[PDB]
Amino acid sequence: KVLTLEGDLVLGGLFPVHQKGGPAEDCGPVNEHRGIQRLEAMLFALDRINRDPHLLPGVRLGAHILDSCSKDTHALEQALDFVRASLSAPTAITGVIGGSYSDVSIQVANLLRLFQIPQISYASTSAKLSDKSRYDYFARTVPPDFFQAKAMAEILRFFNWTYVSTVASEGDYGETGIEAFELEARARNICVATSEKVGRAMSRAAFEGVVRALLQKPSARVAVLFTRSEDARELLAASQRLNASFTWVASDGWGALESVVAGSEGAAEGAITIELASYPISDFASYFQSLDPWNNSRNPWFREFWEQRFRCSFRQRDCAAHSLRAVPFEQESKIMFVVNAVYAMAHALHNMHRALCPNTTRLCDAMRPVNGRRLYKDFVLNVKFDAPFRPADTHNEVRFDRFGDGIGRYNIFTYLRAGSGRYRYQKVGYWAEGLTLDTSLIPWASPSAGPLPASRCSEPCLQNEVKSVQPGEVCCWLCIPCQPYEYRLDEFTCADCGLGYWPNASLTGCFELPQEYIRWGDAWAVGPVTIACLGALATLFVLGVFVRHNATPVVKASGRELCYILLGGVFLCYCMTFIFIAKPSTAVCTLRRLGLGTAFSVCYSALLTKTNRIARISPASQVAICLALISGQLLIVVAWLVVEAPGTGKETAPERREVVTLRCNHRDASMLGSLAYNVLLIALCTLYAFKTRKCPENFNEAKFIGFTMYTTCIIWLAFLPIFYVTSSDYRVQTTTMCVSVSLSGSVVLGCLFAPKLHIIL
Amino acid sequence: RREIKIEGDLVLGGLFPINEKGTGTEECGRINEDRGIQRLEAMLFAIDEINKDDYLLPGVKLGVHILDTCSRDTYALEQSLEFVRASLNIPLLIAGVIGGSYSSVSIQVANLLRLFQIPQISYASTSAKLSDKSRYDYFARTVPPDFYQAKAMAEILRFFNWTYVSTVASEGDYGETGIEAFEQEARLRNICIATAEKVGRSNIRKSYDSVIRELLQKPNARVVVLFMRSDDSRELIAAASRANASFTWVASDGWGAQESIIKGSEHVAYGAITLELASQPVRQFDRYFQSLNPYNNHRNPWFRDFWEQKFQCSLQNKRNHRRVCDKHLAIDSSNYEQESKIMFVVNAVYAMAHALHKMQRTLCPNTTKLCDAMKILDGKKLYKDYLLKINFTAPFNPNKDADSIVKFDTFGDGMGRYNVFNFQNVGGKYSYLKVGHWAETLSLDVNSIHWSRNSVPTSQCSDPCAPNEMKNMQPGDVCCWICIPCEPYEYLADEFTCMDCGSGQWPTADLTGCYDLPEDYIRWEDAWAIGPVTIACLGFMCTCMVVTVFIKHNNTELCYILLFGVGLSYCMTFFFIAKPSPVICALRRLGLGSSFAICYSALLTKTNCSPSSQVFICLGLILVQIVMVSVWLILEAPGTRRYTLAEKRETVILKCNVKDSSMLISLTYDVILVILCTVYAFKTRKCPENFNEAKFIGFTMYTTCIIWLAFLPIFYVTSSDYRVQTTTMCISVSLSGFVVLGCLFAPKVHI
């Protein structure tokens, strides 16, 4: 059976009018939905094109439609006619509008690529047919099967669903879509946890095992499905038996079919299924509900179709009043694709005729030998016509791409639960180029009640609990609470810049701990002040007594200048000790410690000049020598300040903040020379006193000199190990130094008290 | 059209380029004598021998259906339809197609045949795309593909140690595919590719001259890898001859052993290693082909046209332009040479015959004629089972070398057997010579190879250098590396760089030759130290004389203690030695410090004028301080100075590195204290002795203070070496001893 028409340009066709059948029959039963309705749609489109004055006004299109019988070998055998009609009365096939199954389309494209014959399919959705290296004359008006993977990936990204539990199928549908989805999920930072492969020959116990394997990962509510129509009902039944919710994001295999969810209502509620968008053709329904086996002689298979759908016989009068109008008729979901393919071929032919036959509207001599290469490359893949028979409000565009595939256009569905009615589907969005859903219509995966989460990687860490560790994970990262000794400088790890100082709110400024250099409160701050005040009062009383005793024969025998120098040094050291408990700075702490050292040196010089006269027994020579020594010591201290006095102190590593010091931090090295000079002077003075004190003059003041020599030296010898040991701890060092300075002054004050008592009495 | 149809139980297809490719109105014109007619006659001869054979398909008679391709892809594609229309002019069922002489023709024929499950065996198609079974799952060939010669050439380069090569190719499927195979196979053998370029079909001399100039830019690539076609090879050789150069060409089957490549340029191509496919001559075919005339060869329709085109005569309707063909004209050895693929055609035919025989014996045993279920042949079963697995000896082997076995691999390709030629000169006659063979492994005859000039080419970049002098570092690739010297105080690694094994060691001839230097300070027994040594000896002699004269007098011990310090001071110079010791240095330092302390403190008793016991107790305190350091961990074994920045070949560990730094400071502090005490006491004392005694004591104190003050900066600025450290100490200790001894003895010796 061959359906042939007459026209200037003849268009081929391949429709599955008959099923596979098997080895019993040649082809078998007649397909009433995928072989008859699509063939009549092609015929109707060809008639409309022939009656269209704006589409090929002069050229009349023909038809050479054949039956593939749902077989690839039969398709090759039938396409051999298309080959040996243009190769070598055979018609002239300028292009075939055929191919409803992937294998038939692949075989036909493989055969027709060699002979340069364009082919536009209407129902073949596969990823292999997009390989232009093997099929470079194949086009289609339907999107391939890997666009829905992108659609569901975008859907998952919109709902922030990262942890998926996708289930694929076995065969050709799914065994490429799952890899396409996995490739398109990495770009959206979506990681797949568990992946099964449902097979066509598969036991129900295996389905139960698959569903149980879905329960192995607990926090995976979503599950992307690439199963076929018959491979999803079993999964739904198993899920219902195991009482799992398992919100589904399925491909076109589920769609809005009522034969896959019936009998398993309750477990599939809330699923997100996607179906290819298709609008009904108003004129096609009227055309199809007007045909009878008497006035329709063009179609050779209409006889068998009428005999099959209407159970009757034609050898004997059994059915004569049957009509298609009374019968309820539903259009095939891929009729608009068939008419779009036919119209695309017609538009390509018209564009070629305009670009090659500009003299007359009739087929000129130039276009008589139609070539497939130029028509496919420059005309077929460049059509931008509006979709015929489209809805008035809806704007539909028919165009191909670099790979010749159709334009992606999918409808997002949701399996709702009507309050008064039964279960039904409802469209909640679309996907033409970008994702678009009506979020305020999903009842079960609703935002008002909280959309279902699937991440399996929680984020309970905000600023201090962040660690971001992952034993072989890239999609998410678990954060482990780290010790507060670290800082959150980087959002990927606990930057332990310093264990002591606590970071700020931003946890970025890894520097010294912000605090105030304060250590004197009310515990012992008053006590040192009280001791200093008592020492100052004692010094003032001694000065007053000496002033009262200034004009006296007793004071004339002894050197008043030495006593005045000693009193001044004691006052200076007392003032330095009193002010040492103060906020350190550049000109405060170091100046005070230098003044204390100078006061100690002056006291040592005063003792030396008090004892040298006693040992001898020009007086101004000793005073000048002592003044020169004090000036030299002060100059040495000042030179130490200018050259080699860098001071900074802060404890950072062990549980500590910044030390309370500004410039008097490395003063131990600076004071080392002053300490050595003071020790040498004290040793010389003690030796001189030991050699001296033989002469009992000035009311035995040599006894007082020896008392000072035996007291100050002993105090220094006791304090030196204490000062060395206390130097390790900053807090201990300051108090010990102040106490030692106060005691050094107090020993001299106690020794000088006796002459004051004698003067008073 | 014309065809050769022979009735038989099994019919084999055929595709030969009988007519050469034409242009214009005529699709195909003149007859191909060598590739179309001769190969067709070889196939017919093989079929006749198979039919006459009794051990190969005895009851089955092999038919044939041969069609012409006209050396055109589209013509062959349209003519292949009669091979598939029989499975749907009475059609004949085609078991297999023995055809395909061009890569494009074979590609399209296989593309058409794979849909109808018809096996195809080629005899001259060597394209690499035909090895892709995903696109060609019913294609086989008895010839190896074109990327086996690339592997053979890479193996030749690896054997000859030619790492730096210069590969030049042609434009098209052949050159591009082969150069891609070469540059994906050479990286596995550590062979680098330099100035990789290709020539086009412009047929202009300027491009070839530019290619030659670009090749001449690099002088470390003496060998040139050519995988270009015959005309491109000839043009490149001519361009190399112009503006004469010198290169070692490693060519492929495009050059081979053809003399068309060399004509007038037999000098630049000298010593060129070329590859040619091995093809044994079929002797039985000579008698068959030479005894053919248009009178008995009625099977071949193209034989008459081939005869009239080869002999330039006419048989029927002869005009005055062409002479009438003469009688007794026959093909003989005078004007006939075998095509190089006759054996490949015969092997293809016999492979198909063996597959059919195996199927016949397997499907139905105990019978010879065709059986049931063999009327229709399954292409998949015939190809994947009975065709890809055959192990039979090549028919018509002149000597049965046992290395000519026809078998197909997993991809259906044949076995690669190439002959390695070498264009040389013998006795003033330029000719080729087979100097090797490549079946599965390279086997060359190096003795008979005549390279360019008179020595084997090197063609290697970055020639090796001494690892101890220069470090081997690859800047961008392993191909070339620069010899850059490394530091001379560090050893060498395997191939990376030079690293040091710490301070105090110097490398040697060994790879890891850094060892600790056994160097110490410089001996001064017979060296620069003479004057200080003589001064120390004189001081020791004077001290000994003073001790002797003092010991002789019996109250005419305090001076002996001071003299003992001088004696203990003298041994400090002798203590300084290059012999390493962790205790001797500390002992010498402590002894010197104690000697200085006691010598300075001996004057305290004189200045202050029971006191002897206190002086001894005071001296013990200084000694107790010296031994206190030994209690702590301050003392340590001597260590070499860390003079890494200084360019010192060797280091000396003699100062103990922990002894001097603190001992000098402690001794200086003690000396300063005692000197200040003595200076204070000297002026206070109102001469409690003889007039000269007080003056002598004052002069001694002043001299000791001056000597210590002068020696203090020397200690800090010593910059301790083998000389200055010992010399300064010796001078200081000699000055200290002389000051005490002089002021102690001169007033005494005077009176």
Ligand SMILES: N[C@](CC1c2ccccc2Oc2ccccc21)(C(=O)O)[C@H]1C[C@@H]1C(=O)O
């Ligand atoms: N477009 C389909 C898609 C088809 C398919 C669709 C859903 C489930 C299973 C399934 O089997 C496969 C396998 C591989 C490729 C495509 C499919 C085509 O045949 O190409 C088919 C609807 C078209 C038709 O036959 O009318």
Ligand SMILES: N[C@](CC1c2ccccc2Oc2ccccc21)(C(=O)O)[C@H]1C[C@@H]1C(=O)O
């Ligand atoms: N075996 C060849 C190899 C051939 C070839 C050999 C050398 C130089 C150029 C060249 O052109 C190409 C290009 C692509 C692939 C193969 C080749 C074939 O035609 O396949 C050719 C000897 C066979 C024949 O034509 O009789």
Ligand SMILES: *[C@@H]1O[C@H](CO)[C@@H](O)[C@H](O)[C@H]1NC(C)=O
């Ligand atoms: C997904 O997360 C983003 C923030 O990353 C948020 O803005 C958006 O509202 C979320 N979508 C939901 C909750 O549906």
Ligand SMILES: *[C@@H]1O[C@H](CO)[C@@H](O)[C@H](O)[C@H]1NC(C)=O
């Ligand atoms: C290539 O180098 C190896 C390495 O030493 C050597 O054994 C071999 O003989 C060389 N081949 C030559 C020089 O042909």
